[PDB]
């Protein structure tokens with residue numbers, strides 16, 4: 001078993017191998033740094049199975065020395081649950097966290113988006129979209145979706161930023177301040193029905209605050225990167241920026257085509273566990289063996305997509321895996337699209353003379369994460 005990761009993904013590209021195996025119709029076996037060897041799925045068909053098939057448990061690695069990447073062991077989160085606990089827990093949260101409820105935020109997003117622009121270009125010459133726009137937009141929208149008082153939208157932020165750049169005694173101090181402030185908020189909503197109110201309706205207080213902290217994590221630093229990384233990719237392919245400044249009616253299907261093509265992690269997912277013998281790619285991953293997935297190789301499979309390694313805003317359908325598949329599919333999906341749609345949309349519309357302030361090859365990324373994130377994205381206009 002050839003060791004994994006294959007190469008520290010510097011910048012935003014992928015190691016050839018993944019696509020090599022997809023096409024080989026080969027299921028990879030790799031040696032992860034911690035825990036042991038794992039299997040590795042790269043095909044759309046075989047990444048679809050691991051997302052949706054019930055022969056693969058996410059439960060079965062809580063408290064375990066499982067084929068992993070970071071030494072720390074994972075601490076029961078929703079994304080580490082199987083049916084029917086997961087299903088009862090998702091079934092409830094879906095009744096509060098609605099696709100409607102999320103479309104309902106588009107007018108606010110416009111405000112914070114279009115006034116985040118106002119400020120940014122109202123300041124200096126060159127800017128840093130990351131600190132001036134890509135990072136603030138999603139926390140502000142997270143807050144607004146929780147119905148956090150705008151008088152604490154900053155104090156709050158400051159707490160979510162110190163989850164690193166902050167001392168150990170003031171990491172947990174932040175978390176505990178966020179946990180105790182987020183229960184009190186749910187306490188001051190039980191007497192009244194928005195998202196936190198709707199959540200109180202069968203969920204335990206423990207699961208209620210749990211979820212509120214999860215959404216913060218699941219969709220803050222991820223949504224930042226999507227906005228950041230997309231702008232980047234769009235500026236290094238203007239044939240396709242231009243295609244969006246001519247008509248903005250495209251941006252929905254664009255957001256999804258940018259989601260397909262940009263890698264969401266620097267490497268393969270947390271591993272799932274086979275709870276019964278399964279065939280993937282002609283191999284019998286036996287019960288107990290572990291399988292990690294690559295969404296990118298699935299998101300550019302020629303057996304599923306035409307001209308995969310090419311952008312195209314007219315794709316009939318777009319069954320990408322950047323936002324998950326089946327039971328555990330991203331329950332921000334709608335908010336994400338909303339955020340990203342209005343984020344890029346105005347951004348483009350407002351400032352159609354946008355460009356890098358530096359030679360792209362010179363635009364640096366970070367070494368100390370699992371998701372690809374720009375260290376800074378300086379621009380001009």
Ligand code: HEM
Pocket residue numbers: 051078079090214215216218219220222223224226264321322323324325327328329330331332333335336
């Ligand atoms: C902006 C880019 C985002 C991307 C690319 C993204 C991607 C994903 C992916 C790939 C999963 C797969 C879970 C899995 O099957 O392992 C997922 C799950 C999830 N995401 Fe997101 N997400 C984003 C933003 C958000 C936001 C903004 C929220 C909440 C406000 C959110 C909440 C969740 C939740 C709760 C799950 C777990 C659902 C479950 O386990 O049933 N995400 N997301």
